[PDB]
Design a protein around this nucleic acid. Structure first.
Lengths: 67, 105, 68
DNA sequence: CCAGTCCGTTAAGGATTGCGCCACAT
DNA sequence: GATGTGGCGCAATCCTTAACGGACTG
């Protein structure tokens, strides 16, 4: 029976469960993409820090050597 | 009119054109077109220059290629054939298409 | 056009291929994205470890300035 | 008049996406 | 039984590309 009301109602109910199931999945993917933007920002910063502290260590080591 | 082919190109037609270019070269586009049915030289020339030529790259547009197009276009404008001289492997038509679709937005 | 005319079944077959392709491309892109997070995370723990190492080193050095 | 180029323009067809139908999982 | 998921198809429409036709030039 593909035309009764019982059928129309059963379909509507699964159609809602599907939209709901897919909103969850798309969300998980959205935050996963944000995670990438986050980590990519944190890594660019950490790499700047590593380079800064390496220059500092180098300059200081050169001070103790000229001692 | 009814004596003109404006549909698709068969692997057969292409091969004839390719051979023709190796025979005489990218010239006398009429001759080969004659052997072909319902097609004139101009078409054969276009089909060759845009698709059948070996030097025509068929790779995706690189990031570096876009730059050149922007720089160039915001100086010469819609001078496709001209900008194509700065893009080895790309045809004037490929630049036009790339600009009106992708780069346009 | 007719839903029975073969001209339709063909046009539908092509779209169905493109649709399965497109949905597969998207499914790969998502797997990649998750993999990309695993790699950024390792590179992240590595860089943080390096920062701590350089800091511990700077501190060791400056300890030579302390007297009595 | 013909050819070889150059270009604007746009129909054709692949790529995406909103809505849903099913079968099967929980 | 009811809701949750994975796979697909359909049909609207977004996006690119091919190449038709006109304008020019030698």
């Amino acid at each position: 029976d593909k035309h009764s009301d019982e059928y129309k109602i059963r379909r509507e109910r699964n159609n809602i469960a599907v939209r709901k199931s897919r909103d969850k999945a798309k969300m998980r993917n959205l935050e996963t993409q944000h995670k990438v933007l986050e980590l990519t920002a944190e890594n660019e910063r950490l790499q700047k820090k590593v380079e800064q502290l390496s220059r500092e260590l180098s300059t200081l080591r050169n001070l103790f050597k000229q001692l | 009119n009814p004596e003109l082919n404006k549909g698709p190109w068969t692997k057969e037609e292409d091969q004839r054109v390719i051979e023709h270019v190796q025979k005489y070269g990218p010239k006398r586009w009429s001759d080969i077109a004659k052997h072909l049915k319902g097609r004139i030289g101009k078409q054969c020339r276009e089909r060759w220059h845009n698709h059948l030529n070996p030097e025509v790259k068929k790779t995706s547009w690189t990031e570096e290629e876009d730059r050149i197009i922007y720089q160039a276009h915001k100086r010469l404008g819609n001078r496709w054939a001209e900008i194509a001289k700065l893009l080895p492997g790309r045809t004037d038509n490929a630049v036009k298409n790339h600009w009106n679709s992708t780069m346009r937005r």
